[PDB]
Design a protein around this ligand. Structure first.
Ligand SMILES: CCCCCCCCCCCCCCCCCC(=O)OC[C@H](COP(=O)([O-])OCC(O)COP(=O)([O-])OC[C@@H](COC(=O)CCCCCCCCCCCCCCCCC)OC(=O)CCCCCCCCCCCCCCCCC)OC(=O)CCCCCCCCCCCCCCCCC
Ligand SMILES: CCCCCCCCCCCCCCCCCC(=O)OC[C@H](COP(=O)([O-])OCC(O)COP(=O)([O-])OC[C@@H](COC(=O)CCCCCCCCCCCCCCCCC)OC(=O)CCCCCCCCCCCCCCCCC)OC(=O)CCCCCCCCCCCCCCCCC
Ligand SMILES: CCCCCCCCCCCCCCCCCC(=O)OC[C@H](COP(=O)([O-])OCC(O)COP(=O)([O-])OC[C@@H](COC(=O)CCCCCCCCCCCCCCCCC)OC(=O)CCCCCCCCCCCCCCCCC)OC(=O)CCCCCCCCCCCCCCCCC
Ligand SMILES: CCCCCCCCCCCCCCCCCC(=O)OC[C@H](COP(=O)([O-])OCC(O)COP(=O)([O-])OC[C@@H](COC(=O)CCCCCCCCCCCCCCCCC)OC(=O)CCCCCCCCCCCCCCCCC)OC(=O)CCCCCCCCCCCCCCCCC
Ligand SMILES: CCCCCCCCCCCCCCCCCC(=O)OC[C@H](COP(=O)([O-])OCC[N+](C)(C)C)OC(=O)CCCCCCCCCCCCCCCCC
Ligand SMILES: CCCCCCCCCCCCCCCCCC(=O)OC[C@H](COP(=O)([O-])OCC[N+](C)(C)C)OC(=O)CCCCCCCCCCCCCCCCC
Ligand SMILES: CCCCCCCCCCCCCCCCCC(=O)OC[C@H](COP(=O)([O-])OCC[N+](C)(C)C)OC(=O)CCCCCCCCCCCCCCCCC
Ligand code: SF4
Ligand code: F3S
Ligand code: FES
Lengths: 64, 198, 44, 42, 75, 83, 102, 279, 102, 217, 114
């Protein structure tokens, strides 16, 4: 019974992963957002707004 | 390690033996109570280990114990207690069947009574219909057979004749001696009719 | 209250005698549970 | 020898009074019937 | 008879468990703990609420079919 | 209890200053709802940033009035830059 | 009645048989039995405060002579503590939203 | 099938018969009335063509003694012999002639009908009991309830004398005095409202008084068992202390007081079963 | 959870000041307020064309602001006394009546 | 507050607005009187002492706060037309049923209970039961339907939502007729050069996000 | 506390004050909604005319002249003004008072450069 429940849970996680990766593909199919100048110095990504920027392609300037 | 088994066995033995001690009292009280609501005085006056007795009797007859925990005397006492609980279950089934037959007779009587009350402007019929007569005949036959089956137990026979037969007498008093009355009450007018001054 | 209410029902209404005291005591339990539930929720 | 007989009496009386209060709303009237027979201010 | 109204409790329920009095302290502790949990969350919801109008609180209305809700002037 | 009821009635009333006139109050309400074409792109960023600094209607009103002032200035500059 | 009496008998026999099957079908019988005993325990062994103390006062537990006052103290303390917590939460909310108002 | 016609007939029945609420056929055709009018109930459930049929007899009061039973016997011997009634003792000691003597359940023989010739006097069966014939109800349900109470002396223990009498004394004899004089006439039971509604589960004032008499019998040692037998369901509890069981006793007994004391003993019996059984 | 949430957080001083100023306005600006409520009762003025009610609303708000200013020295003194009484209150009817007569 | 019944709307240029104003003013007196009665009840209940009011207020007087809210909202919308109801069936079906359950539009005869009782009457006429039982088993389902029909206060909240929606719709539709003359010239060009039934408020937000994602910036 | 008559005077007066503020709000919002709808309609018609956006039913697609859209110019200018003046925007983790001070400083700078 435990293994059957674990299999059902992993199947549900696989469904959730497919939904998540399709959402990520939809997010990433958008053109890159340029961040140069002050837009680089103060990136819009923050813990408050992370869900509004997840899997969005940016071209950010900075020093590694 | 075997805490679950130990607790289950001690709970079952404790309840079974405790209700085995207080079982003959309950059976005797149920004998005193009329067949109509044999469980009364337990719903009203004292539920002196009646519902607990029924529940744990069914459990004891439908559970199993581990004889490893029991001693010799403990196991003998538990088995005697289980036998007493099974006998109580059989006794309760018997009194419940008798009570249900009593309520069959009382339903016949109430059907007759509702047709004679002054409030019954709904339906006043001078003559009882055919199916009620057939029910009366069949129920009287069953009552006679029940009395015959209790021939080995004079006290039970007397109790059944007193309680269940009383409503047969009431049905007798509610009907004139016309039509098929001699045939319907032919089995009744042999012995139990004279028991009720007829 | 419930005892005398049931007695009034049984005395005057013939058809209430069809109910054996086993059913009446079940109505007693249901009524007590309903009253307790009502009193509890009216303060919630 | 009932224990807390006074408490039992008080509890029964309180339960009856509370039930009759909430089931009948006797103390919480509606005065829309009395509104026409009233003199307004302002 | 004709005198049945008494505040005295019925002796049918006045019985007592074999291991002490009726289980009341345990059940009143359980009730108090339940009351603390229940009247601890409604208090949290009541006092920590504010109403805000921003033009960002509004979102497009949609039908049960999911499409946007637009009603014509003349239907 | 009437004190609590009148507190509930007090709350929907915004706190405008004593020395303000009604005309100035109406002007300040005009500026809050002032349409600038530049808002359509600035409002997205403004709402995204203010969504975490808003707990009270006072904060909401102040931040949105400031954002509308910025939008008005930006619209003036844009219309002076793109005739 | 008439020929419909056979239909009446069939219908009543069907109802009786369905009731009998539902009552004493093993799982349903077991769960009805357990429900009946649970109902008995709930109704007859409710947490009362008044009960017959047949035992002599030298035998009654102090837990039974003080259970009334323990229950009353617990309930009253819970009520007054809820009132105090409501007042404290009100003042805390007011102070917090005055601090964050600015 | 037989339903709708029955409903229509009965609803049309009483409504068309509530107007004619007393049929009052006359035995003969009379012109000059120097005689008291007797409306005697008549019903013979032996021929299909018969219904409750109040019959107005006219007869001189002087010719028979001023007793209801004597008047009925005058009616049922000379005018209409078809009338039936139970009567044996002629002294108010057997209880056979209990009928509804002008709106009251009293023994016919020890009773005096009103002397006013203008006002008719009505004689009816005992009331809430099935009617076997004119004024002859069947008290068999009453008699049967007398069998349940075990109305015979029951001794738990014997006496050492074995050749003498049970010691009862004059004082303890008076306890059952005023309880043993009942003639089982069943006039209080048929006029006791608690018995009207529950003839089955309520023993009745007379039967409960006999049970009380056997309970307070000094020699009887089955007091607790008799109390248990009568203190079951509504055998006794149905009595409402109305007091009409005592107002209509021709022998002057007090069934109301007997049942009040019985209920007091029962109420004490329930309490005594806890105080006297705790170890 | 059923009582309406608060929009603007008012301190005790602000709430009492608004109370007293509203009472003064209703005893003084009654006519303008009634006219404004008259304009703001019909469907037009309340929902469709609030532009019409602009002048009456401005008149009412100007009168209320004049009340809130209470430039009179006696009005200021009496209002401060009533505010002190209210804040001590955490009665006052005599102080209020003394203030409103000014 | 004593609004005169005659409306000042043109009735020839804004027919919908004139009809709405006429309906609002026609029923204003009845709803105003009921609102006054409810407010007086609330005030007097607040005036009570201890458990008679001022303690159980407004927590236990919730059946008349709802009545006051419904009365005010319905006072704003003088009469609700069946054409405008069907639109809200897009959001919530059975809204007509809720409005019937809350607004005394008609007499809610218990059709379901009556037909169930007739079904019992058919069975009681086959294996004949007394007509007393027939009457009882006819009253019982009708009584059940009446109990489940009246007292439904969730229908009142559904009607509050519907009335808010309909108020907003009527306010917007009133602005449409006022500015229909002004936008007639622009409407022709917009319709002829932009073939789309999507709203301008909806199309423009698509343009905003499209420029936000893919623009030379 | 005060008399219930005075409390209800306060109630009705505060209802009137709230209604007046709602009237101000309604007038401003209605006139600016008219202006906003006119501007949005004009923008859409201009964009469709100059071949900058192609509208097919519900979804609009970028065209050839999309680089000349007034909306595109507005977006570029908004990004530029945010970069030059609102430097700390979208990442300011300070408290509300510091955020107000930063916004005030940015507004003053824009007023200087207006
Ligand atoms: C104020 C005054 C002081 C307080 C008074 C308090 C009581 C007030 C009246 C209560 C009425 C309701 C009630 O319980 O009635 C029981 C009472 C039943 O009395 P009963 O003890 O069965 O004896 C009456 C007959 O002897 C035998 O009747 P039957 O054989 O025709 O069948 C009776 C049967 C038939 O059922 C009914 O008649 C239904 C009655 C309710 C409708 O009634 C029931 O089973 C009652 C069920 C009630 C359920 C709850 C409703 O109902 C009636 O008498 C109904 C009479 C009207 C309907 C039929 C009319 C002709 C139609 C053609
Ligand atoms: C004027 C107009 C006014 C209109 C106002 C309208 C207001 C709004 C509407 C209000 C509607 C509700 C009001 C009535 C509530 C009735 C509650 C109830 O069912 O009480 C049980 C009650 C049981 O009788 P009792 O008084 O407890 O008698 C027990 C005695 O020991 C023994 O008594 P006995 O000597 O009579 O022995 C016979 C007894 C013996 O019958 C029984 O013992 C059967 C079981 C009955 C319930 C348990 C009773 C046990 C003893 C008490 C302790 C209960 C503890 C648990 C409590 C919860 O009954 C029968 O044999 C009759 C036939 C039963 C056929 C169905 C039996 C099996 C049911 C399914 C069981 C499945 C396994 C268990 C569950 C597994 C998980 C789902 O009455 C009935 O069951 C009869 C009526 C219903 C029959 C069908 C049952 C279906 C279940 C839902 C029925 C709800 C009402 C109808 C709705 C129809 C919708 C389409
Ligand atoms: C929790 C406290 C349990 C307790 O003290 O049990 C012993 C105690 C046994 O008393 P006793 O004087 O030895 O025997 C008489 C019982 O009637 C004999 O009853 P019993 O011994 O068969 O009952 C055993 C008891 C469990 O008792 C044990 O396991 C005894 C050992 C505990 C350690 O079972 C339960 O409490 C489980 C059923 C609970 C049903 C609740 C329904 C709510 C709706 O159980 C009770 O007094 C039952 C209390 C039920 C309270 C229900 C409240 C509803 C509101
Ligand atoms: C048809 C109309 C019938 C009702 C007519 C009267 C309506 C008016 C209200 C009324 O009379 O209420 C009294 C009514 C009965 O009064 P009565 O019939 O006039 O005669 C009372 C006796 O003279 C003296 O009363 P007593 O001391 O003899 O009463 C014994 C009482 C002693 O009980 C207590 O003291 C209980 C205390 C806690 C109650 C709340 C528990 C919440 C959990 O036990 C009961 O009444 C029954 C046991 C408790 C039932 C509720 C708890 C269990 C609920 C869940 C059961 C679920 C079904 C079974 C499991 C199924 C599994 C599948 O009592 C109740 O309803 C019992 C609950 C009382 C709660 C308040 C207690 C005082 C609070 C003070 C603060
Ligand atoms: C003819 C039948 C008339 C009565 C029809 C029924 C009416 C009441 C129905 C509901 C009863 C509810 C209570 C109940 O169960 O009671 C049953 C009880 C039962 O009484 P019972 O005596 O039949 O009891 C039978 C009991 N068993 C069978 C067990 C032995 O009471 C009645 O039936 C009372 C009936 C009379 C009530 C009043 C009727 C008035 C009718 C109009 C009279 C107009 C003229 C008045 C005088 C004018 C003088 C100038
Ligand atoms: C004079 C003051 C009168 C205050 C009247 C309003 C009380 C509001 C608090 C109750 C509440 O909302 O409870 C939430 C909840 C539920 O409230 P409820 O069930 O009473 O109200 C209905 C609530 N709903 C909508 C959910 C159905 O909890 C309780 O009521 C349980 C007890 C909580 C006690 C909280 C404080 C009570 C204050 C009044 C006590 C008695 C008067 C004396 C006060 C002191 C005077 C110096
Ligand atoms: C979860 C399970 C809950 C089970 C029930 C609750 C716990 C046990 C319990 O209380 O049982 C009820 C028991 C019931 O037992 P009982 O003693 O009432 O038993 C008699 C029963 N009747 C009423 C039917 C006759 O009652 C109590 O324990 C007391 C209840 C509260 C009493 C009042 C408390 C407040 C006193 C005033 C405070 C004032 C403060 C200042 C203002
Ligand atoms: S107690 Fe009196 S009225 Fe009753 S049966 Fe005996 S003699 Fe007759
Ligand atoms: S009227 Fe009958 S009810 Fe009791 S006192 Fe008399 S015996
Ligand atoms: S004839 Fe004996 S009692 Fe009358």
């Amino acid at each position: 019974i435990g293994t059957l429940l674990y299999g059902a849970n992993q199947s549900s996680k696989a469904r959730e992963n497919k939904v998540a990766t399709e959402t990520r593909k939809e997010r990433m199919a958008k053109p890159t957002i340029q961040l140069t100048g002050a837009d680089s110095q103060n990136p819009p990504f923050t813990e408050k707004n992370i869900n509004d920027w997840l899997y969005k392609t940016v071209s950010i300037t900075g020093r590694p | 390690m075997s805490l679950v088994s130990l607790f289950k066995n001690t709970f079952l033995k404790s309840r079974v033996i405790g209700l085995s001690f207080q079982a003959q009292r309950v059976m005797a009280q149920m004998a005193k109570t009329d067949f109509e609501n044999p469980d009364e005085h337990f719903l009203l006056n004292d539920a002196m280990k009646y519902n607990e007795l029924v529940f744990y009797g069914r459990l004891a007859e439908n559970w199993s114990i581990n004889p490893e925990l029991f001693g010799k005397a403990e196991l003998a006492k538990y088995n005697e207690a289980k036998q007493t609980l099974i006998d109580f279950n059989q006794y309760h089934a018997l009194v419940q069947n008798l009570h249900e037959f009593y309520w069959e007779l009382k339903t016949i009587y109430l059907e007759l009574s509702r047709g004679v009350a002054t409030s019954n402007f709904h339906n006043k019929r001078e003559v009882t219909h055919s199916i009620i007569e057939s029910d009366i005949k069949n129920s009287i036959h069953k009552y006679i057979q029940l009395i015959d089956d209790l021939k080995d137990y004079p006290e039970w026979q007397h109790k059944v004749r007193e309680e269940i037969g009383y409503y047969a007498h009431m049905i007798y008093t509610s009907v004139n001696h016309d039509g098929n009355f001699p045939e319907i009450f032919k089995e009744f007018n042999k012995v139990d009719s004279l028991y009720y001054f007829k | 209250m419930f005892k005398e209410l049931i007695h009034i029902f049984r005395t005057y209404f013939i058809t209430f005698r069809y109910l054996k005291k086993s059913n009446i005591n079940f109505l007693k339990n249901l009524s007590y549970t309903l009253i307790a539930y009502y009193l509890i929720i009216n303060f919630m | 020898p009932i224990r807390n007989i006074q408490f039992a009496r008080y509890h029964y009386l309180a339960a009856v009074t509370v039930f009759t209060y909430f089931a009948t709303r006797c103390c919480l009237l509606d005065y829309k019937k009395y509104y026409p027979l009233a003199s307004v201010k302002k | 008879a004709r005198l049945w109204w008494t505040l005295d409790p019925s002796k049918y329920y006045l019985k007592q468990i074999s291991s002490g009095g009726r289980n009341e302290i345990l059940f009143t502790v359980l009730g108090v703990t339940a009351a603390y949990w229940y009247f601890g969350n409604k208090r949290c919801e009541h006092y920590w609420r504010r109403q805000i109008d921003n033009c960002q609180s509004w979102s497009r209305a949609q039908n049960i079919n999911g499409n946007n809700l637009t009603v014509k002037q003349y239907f | 209890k009437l004190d609590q009821i009148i507190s509930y009635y007090i709350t929907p009333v915004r706190r405008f200053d004593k020395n303000l006139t009604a005309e100035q109050i109406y002007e300040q309400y005009q500026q809050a709802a002032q349409f600038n074409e530049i808002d359509a792109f600035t409002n997205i960023r403004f709402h995204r940033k203010f969504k975490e600094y808003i707990q009270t209607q006072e904060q909401s009103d102040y931040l949105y009035e400031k954002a509308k002032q910025i939008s008005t200035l930006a619209q003036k500059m844009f219309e002076k830059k793109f005739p | 009645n008439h020929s419909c009496q056979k239909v009446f008998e069939g219908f009543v026999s069907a109802l009786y048989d369905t009731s009998y099957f539902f009552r004493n079908f093993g799982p349903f019988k077991a769960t009805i039995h357990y429900a009946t005993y649970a109902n008995y325990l709930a109704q007859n062994w409710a947490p009362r405060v008044s009960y017959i103390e047949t035992s002599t006062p030298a035998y009654t537990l102090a837990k039974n002579k003080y259970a009334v006052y323990i229950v009353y103290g617990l309930i009253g303390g819970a009520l007054i503590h809820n009132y105090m917590l409501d007042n404290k939460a009100a003042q805390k909310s007011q102070q917090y939203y005055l601090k964050h108002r600015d | 099938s037989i339903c709708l016609e029955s409903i229509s007939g009965t609803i049309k029945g009483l409504q068309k018969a509530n107007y004619v609420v007393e049929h009052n056929p006359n035995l003969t055709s009379e012109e000059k009335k120097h005689l008291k009018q007797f409306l005697v109930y008549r019903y013979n459930p032996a021929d299909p063509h018969d219904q409750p049929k109040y019959v107005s007899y006219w007869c001189d009061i002087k010719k028979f003694p001023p007793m209801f039973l004597d008047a009925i016997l005058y009616i049922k011997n000379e005018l209409d012999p078809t009338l039936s009634i139970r009567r044996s003792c002629r002294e108010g000691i057997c209880g056979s002639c209990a009928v509804n003597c002008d709106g009251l359940h009293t023994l016919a023989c020890i009773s005096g009908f009103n002397r006013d010739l203008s006002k008719p006097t009505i004689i009816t069966p005992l009331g809430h009991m099935f009617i076997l014939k004119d004024l002859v109800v069947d008290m068999t349900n009453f008699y049967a309830q007398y069998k349940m109470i075990e109305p015979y002396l029951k001794r738990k223990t014997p006496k050492p004398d074995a050749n003498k009498e049970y010691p009862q004394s004059p004082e303890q004899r008076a306890l059952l005095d005023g309880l043993y004089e009942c003639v089982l006439c069943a006039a209080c039971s048929t006029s006791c409202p608690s018995y009207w509604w529950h003839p089955d589960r309520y023993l009745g004032p007379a039967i409960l008084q006999q049970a009380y008499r056997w309970i307070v019998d000094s020699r009887d040692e089955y007091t607790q068992e008799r109390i248990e037998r009568i203190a079951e369901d509504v055998r006794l509890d149905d009595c409402q202390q109305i007091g009409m069981c005592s107002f209509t006793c021709p022998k002057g007994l007090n069934p109301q007081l007997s049942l009040k004391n019985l209920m007091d003993m029962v109420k004490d019996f329930r309490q005594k079963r806890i105080e006297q059984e705790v170890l | 959870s059923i009582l309406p949430p608060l929009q603007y957080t008012y301190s005790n001083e602000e709430s009492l000041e608004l109370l007293i100023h509203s009472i003064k306005g209703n005893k003084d600006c009654n006519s303008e307020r009634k006219a404004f409520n008259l304009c703001r009762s019909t469907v037009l003025g309340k929902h469709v064309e609030p532009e019409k009610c602009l002048d009456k609303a401005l008149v009412f708000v100007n009168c209320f602001q004049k009340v809130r200013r209470d430039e009179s020295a006696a009005c200021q003194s009496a209002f401060n006394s009533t505010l002190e009484c209210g804040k001590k209150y955490s009665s006052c009817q005599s102080q209020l009546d003394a203030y409103l007569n000014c | 507050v004593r609004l005169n019944l005659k409306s000042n709307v043109d009735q020839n240029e804004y027919p919908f607005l004139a009809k709405w104003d006429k309906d609002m003013r026609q029923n204003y007196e009845e709803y105003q009187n009921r609102i006054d009665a409810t407010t007086y009840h609330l005030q007097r209940s607040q005036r009570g002492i201890a458990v008679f009011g001022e303690w159980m207020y407004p927590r236990y007087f919730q059946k008349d706060i709802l009545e006051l809210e419904v009365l005010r909202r319905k006072q704003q919308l003088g009469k609700i037309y069946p054409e405008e109801v069907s639109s809200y069936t897009q959001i919530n079906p059975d809204i007509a049923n809720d409005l019937n359950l809350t607004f005394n539009a008609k007499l809610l005869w218990p059709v379901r209970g009556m037909t169930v009782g007739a079904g019992f009457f058919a069975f009681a006429h086959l294996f004949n039961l007394p007509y007393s039982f027939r009457l009882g088993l006819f009253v019982l389902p009708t009584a059940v339907e009446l109990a489940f029909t009246w007292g439904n206060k969730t229908s009142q909240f559904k009607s509050i939502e519907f009335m808010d929606y309909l108020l907003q719709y009527r306010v917007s539709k009133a602005l449409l007729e006022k500015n229909a003359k002004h936008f007639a010239e622009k409407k022709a060009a917009y319709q002829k050069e932009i073939n789309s039934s999507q709203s301008v408020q909806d199309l423009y937000n698509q343009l905003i996000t499209l420029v936000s994602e893919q623009a030379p910036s | 506390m005060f008399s219930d008559f005075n409390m209800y005077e306060a109630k009705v007066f505060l209802k009137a004050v709230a209604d007046a503020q709602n009237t101000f709000r309604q007038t401003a919002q209605q006139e600016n909604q008219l202006a906003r709808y006119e501007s949005q309609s004009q923008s859409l018609l201009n964009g469709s005319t100059s071949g900058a956006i192609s509208i097919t039913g519900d979804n609009i697609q970028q065209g050839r002249n999309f680089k000349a859209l007034k909306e595109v110019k507005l977006f570029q200018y908004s990004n530029e003004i945010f970069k030059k003046y609102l430097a700390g925007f979208d990442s300011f983790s300070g408290d509300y008072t510091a955020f107000k001070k930063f916004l005030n400083e940015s507004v003053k700078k824009i007023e200087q450069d207006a």
